[PDB]
Amino acid sequence: GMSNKFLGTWKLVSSENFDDYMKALGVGLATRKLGNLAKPTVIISKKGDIITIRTESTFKNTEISFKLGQEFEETTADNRKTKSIVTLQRGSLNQVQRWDGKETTIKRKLVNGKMVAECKMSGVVCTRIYEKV
Ligand SMILES: CCCCCCCCCCCCCCCC(=O)O
Ligand SMILES: [Cl-]
């Protein structure tokens, strides 16, 4: 299933077009000002068939535990309450979030030993790169 190369503790090192992505989610300015300044660290772990993705930052922390391909309630860092699913496509980890008839996706794939996360919303595209510790 999911590559054990994902398991570990990743540190963000680059964000591209994050603001426009947050605006597309309806995030207020003042909140964005801190989001753009944030440098989260992501911890991915598994217990059996359950995967957990934790996000730690000075501003907000998050955590989702899920089985692949099974819908699950999620609370995003901007406090959206979504019905999310995580799929596996060509070794990429694709998280979708549905709420209020709106929809966003966060695709996570490994590239040359780095985790790359693409966030798409209303045509906007974010690209955040993480480095293993
Ligand atoms: C995780 C930092 C929180 C920033 C402040 C909340 C506003 C943004 C909420 C949605 C961001 C989702 C992007 C996740 C991308 C990643 O894997 O780093
Ligand atoms: Cl931080």
Side-chain angles (χ1 to χ4, degrees), residues 12 14-15 18 21-22 25 27-28 31-32 34-42 53 55-62 74 76-80 95 97 104-108 115-119 126-130:
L12 177 61
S14 157
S15 204
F18 196 24
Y21 178 68
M22 308 206 266
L25 300 177
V27 176
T31 302
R32 304 201 305 264
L34 302 180
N36 303 320
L37 292 191
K39 287 174 162 41
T41 130
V42 178
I53 297 180
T55 332
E56 306 192 346
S57 71
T58 306
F59 184 9
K60 235 283 189 144
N61 298 346
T62 63
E74 177 180 351
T76 67
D78 52 323
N79 202 25
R80 283 170 297 121
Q95 184 190 1
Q97 296 167 344
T104 185
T105 69
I106 304 166
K107 324 200 172 182
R108 303 187 164 85
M115 194 179 62
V116 181
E118 312 178 3
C119 333
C126 184
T127 306
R128 289 152 85 71
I129 308 182
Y130 298 67

Side-chain angles (χ1 to χ4, degrees), residues 38-83:
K39 287 174 162 41
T41 130
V42 178
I43 304 88
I44 309 200
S45 55
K46 77 164 199 93
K47 287 175 170 194
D49 60 331
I50 293 185
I51 295 156
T52 303
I53 297 180
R54 179 181 188 76
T55 332
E56 306 192 346
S57 71
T58 306
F59 184 9
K60 235 283 189 144
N61 298 346
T62 63
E63 176 166 305
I64 45 168
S65 284
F66 57 84
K67 299 160 185 239
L68 271 176
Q70 296 196 15
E71 204 179 84
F72 71 101
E73 285 293 331
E74 177 180 351
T75 300
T76 67
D78 52 323
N79 202 25
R80 283 170 297 121
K81 304 256 170 162
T82 65
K83 277 152 185 301

